[PDB]
């Protein structure tokens, strides 16, 4: 029947080698381990992950393995075949994993495309074929940690993992956080696995997730003095001690302009939604 060692970690005995491979025996079958992965000696045991390659050969790898039967791993979509599903590269040598069309959206416009990213685990069927199973919301919730509430107006990459009529669920891989994009904050329907450049536009307290947009920042024309102050804030950590109550001397020493000119410039930045002020100074927002 089926080879229950496929897509699993095994300890096998190295029984032979050639210039390219160690040949590893386990339960009457021989698995080929690429020599370039590391040195071994014939007659010793070796631990690795057993699978089959695209040439139908039994393989073992000692490299780090991400997607297994028990653990999810990221894969890059390498090929779309409409009558089959999508192929994804999770880093198994000489093996890409098929995610079946039966677990992809019905609508082809929502399928992953080449270059998209999917978070999958492995399954072996009764014919010893490996397939990829998509993570669902609960898996992303287990992976991620609660978002922080100090990220407004930052941009981050965001990977689509779940599609709904109400909006798009995304994972932020640089941050290990979850977010959401309402339809009004994007253009075309995102596809499954699409990698987006998302801007933080709010914080959702109930589940500590980020509200995100794909829309451009508001166009806001700034006069020269306001632009000078904005560039200064961007270069000085988003903060300065100066505000509309500062002394003429301190304003002149830093910016070379009158207090009236400075107040007009801060007013322009306020109206443009770029700053806020309090007793401690002016903050970029």
Q: Kindly list the residues in this chain that would bind Cl ion in the complex (CB under 5 A).
A: 205-206
Minimum distance of Cl ion from residue 205's CB (angstroms): 4
Instruction: Report which residue's Cβ sits closest to Cl ion.
Output: 206
Burial class (CB in 10 A: 0-12, 13-18, 19+), 181: buried
Element (H, E) at 143: helix 137-143
Sign of CA dihedral 3, 8, 11, 14: positive
Spatial strand order of the sheet with 117-124 comes to 97-100, 85-89, 73-81, 117-124, 130-134
Minimum distance of Cl ion from residue 147's CB (angstroms): 12
Residue 267 makes CB contacts below 8 A (sequence gap 6+) with none
Which neighbouring-strand residues pair with 99? 86
Of the two residues 188 and 206, which places its CB atom closer to Cl ion in the complex? 206
Bridging pattern class, strands 209-213 and 177-181? parallel
Of the two residues 60 and 147, which places its CB atom closer to Cl ion in the complex? 147
Contact yes or no for 255/264 (Cβ under 8 A): no
Minimum distance of Cl ion from residue 177's CB (angstroms): 16
Sign of CA dihedral 99, 105, 107, 110: negative
Minimum distance of Cl ion from residue 273's CB (angstroms): 23
Of 26, 23, 33, 32, which is closest to residue 5 (Cα–Cα)? 26
Of the two residues 105 and 202, which places its CB atom closer to Cl ion in the complex? 202
CA–CA separation, 197 and 216 (whole Å) = 11
Helix (H, G, I), strand (E, B) or coil at 10: strand
Contact yes or no for 94/63 (Cβ under 8 A): no
Of the two residues 12 and 167, which places its CB atom closer to Cl ion in the complex? 167
Minimum distance of Cl ion from residue 204's CB (angstroms): 5
Of the two residues 131 and 180, which places its CB atom closer to Cl ion in the complex? 180
Of the two residues 208 and 259, which places its CB atom closer to Cl ion in the complex? 208
Of the two residues 147 and 269, which places its CB atom closer to Cl ion in the complex? 147
Phi/psi zone of residue 237: left (φ > 0), alpha (ψ -120 to 50 degrees), beta?
Answer: left
Minimum distance of Cl ion from residue 92's CB (angstroms): 41
Minimum distance of Cl ion from residue 203's CB (angstroms): 9
Of the two residues 81 and 164, which places its CB atom closer to Cl ion in the complex? 164
Minimum distance of Cl ion from residue 231's CB (angstroms): 35
């Amino acid at each position: 029947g089926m080879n229950t060692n496929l897509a699993s970690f095994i300890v096998g005995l190295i029984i032979d080698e050639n210039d390219r491979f160690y040949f590893v025996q386990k339960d009457g079958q021989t698995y080929a381990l690429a020599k370039e992965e590391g040195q071994h000696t014939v007659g010793d045991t070796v631990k690795g992950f057993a699978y089959t390659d695209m040439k139908q050969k039994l393989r073992l790898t000692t490299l780090e393995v991400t997607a297994t039967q028990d653990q999810f791993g990221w894969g890059r979509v390498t090929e779309v075949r409409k009558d089959l599903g999508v192929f994804v590269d999770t880093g198994l040598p000489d093996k890409e994993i098929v995610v079946s069309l039966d677990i992809l959206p019905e609508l082809k416009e929502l399928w992953p495309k080449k270059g998209d990213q999917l978070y999958i685990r492995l399954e072996v069927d009764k014919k010893d074929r490996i397939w990829g199973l998509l993570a669902y919301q609960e898996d992303f919730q287990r992976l991620a940690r609660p978002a922080y509430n100090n990220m407004q107006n930052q941009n981050w990459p965001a990977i689509v993992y779940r599609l709904k009529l109400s909006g798009t669920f995304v994972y932020l891989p640089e941050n290990n956080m979850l977010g959401f994009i309402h339809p009004s904050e994007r253009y075309a329907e995102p596809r499954l696995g699409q990698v987006l450049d998302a801007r933080v536009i709010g914080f959702r307290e109930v589940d500590r997730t980020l509200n995100l947009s794909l829309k451009p920042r508001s166009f806001e024309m700034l006069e020269n003095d306001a632009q000078m102050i904005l560039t200064y804030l961007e270069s000085n950590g988003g903060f300065m001690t100066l505000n509309d109550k500062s002394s003429p001397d301190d304003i002149k020493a830093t910016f070379g302009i009158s207090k009236g000119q400075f107040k007009k410039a801060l007013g322009g930045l306020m109206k443009a939604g770029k700053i806020k002020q309090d007793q401690f100074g002016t903050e970029l927002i």
